[PDB]
Amino acid sequence: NLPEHWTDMNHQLFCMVQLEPGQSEYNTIKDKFTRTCSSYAIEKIERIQNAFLWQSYQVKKRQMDIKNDHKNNERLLFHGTDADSVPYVNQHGFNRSCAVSYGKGTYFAVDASYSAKDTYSKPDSNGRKHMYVVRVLTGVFTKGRAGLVTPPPKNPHNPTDLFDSVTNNTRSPKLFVVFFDNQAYPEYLITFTA
């Protein structure tokens, strides 16, 4: 059950589709970025069409919607990465084994400007920076802390009923950490410069 906006893959399971500037889908993604990164130049935006990553993500979304007895489990967040990680992420998504002050998971920023720091979106030899727009199953979240290998329990009376994610700040979060494969789908890659 692959999404409408996806374009035809001629019976293939993975492609990167460059968005046409000026069109509905490109503008939507551009505006999410420019909210905090308007001083940056966008070279291009690619839609990640990864059927396998999508199916595994969607199964986890349906599980979490049942578990939490609501939708509102999903947020659109940013992830800056070096150019040499881009192919792996395109194919395999986010892997916690590859500063973890709020725990040993994969980090995602509320604001593109946070992910646009050179420490995350490392400029390549040409000054090209890379940032993903990511669907993340943040679900029910709590404040994290160093050393977590999974999120904490909602009640230590029930040690295996866990929060879905952890944050820096529960009232006003600026980052989310997830600890399980297939809790994040890389949806768009932004290639840009300072």
Ligand X SMILES: COc1cc(OCc2cccc(Br)c2)ccc1C(N)=O
Q: Decide if residue 105 touches ligand X (CB under 6 A).
A: no
Q: Which is nearer to ligand X, 53 or 175 (CB)?
A: 175
Give the Å distances, CA to CA, from 75 to 78, 93, 99, 123, 155. 10, 16, 23, 26, 24
The whole-angstrom separation of Cα 79 and Cα 174 is 12
Using CB under 6 A, pick the residue from 37, 45, 48, 109 that binds ligand X. 109
Q: Are 64 and 137 in contact (CB under 8 A)?
A: yes
Residue 112: its H or E element: helix 112-115
Segment interacting with a second copy, rule: CB under 8 A, options 16-24, 31-39, 41-49, 92-100 = 92-100
Q: Which is nearer to a second copy, 90 or 112 (CB)?
A: 90
- Which listed option, ligand X, a second copy, none, makes contact with residue 41 (CB within 5 to 8 Å by class)? none
Q: Which two tokens stand for residue 70?
A: 């609501």
Candidates 127, 143, 135; CA nearest to 183 is 135
Handedness of CA 73, 76, 81, 84 (dihedral sign): positive
Using CB under 8 A, pick the residue from 150, 152, 154, 168 that binds a second copy. 150
Using CB under 8 A, pick the residue from 73, 90, 106, 167 that binds a second copy. 90
The whole-angstrom separation of Cα 35 and Cα 25 is 16
Site mask for ligand X (CB under 6 A), range 26-45, x = bound: --------------------
The whole-angstrom separation of Cα 50 and Cα 136 is 16
Using CB under 8 A, pick the residue from 91, 113, 142, 168 that binds a second copy. 91
Query: Where on the chain is the footprint of ligand X (CB under 6 A)?
Result: 78-80, 99, 101-102, 107, 109, 114-115, 120, 175
Query: Where on the chain is the footprint of a second copy (CB under 8 A)?
Result: 13, 52, 55-56, 59-60, 63, 66-67, 87-88, 90-92, 95-98, 104, 149-150, 159-160, 162, 179-182
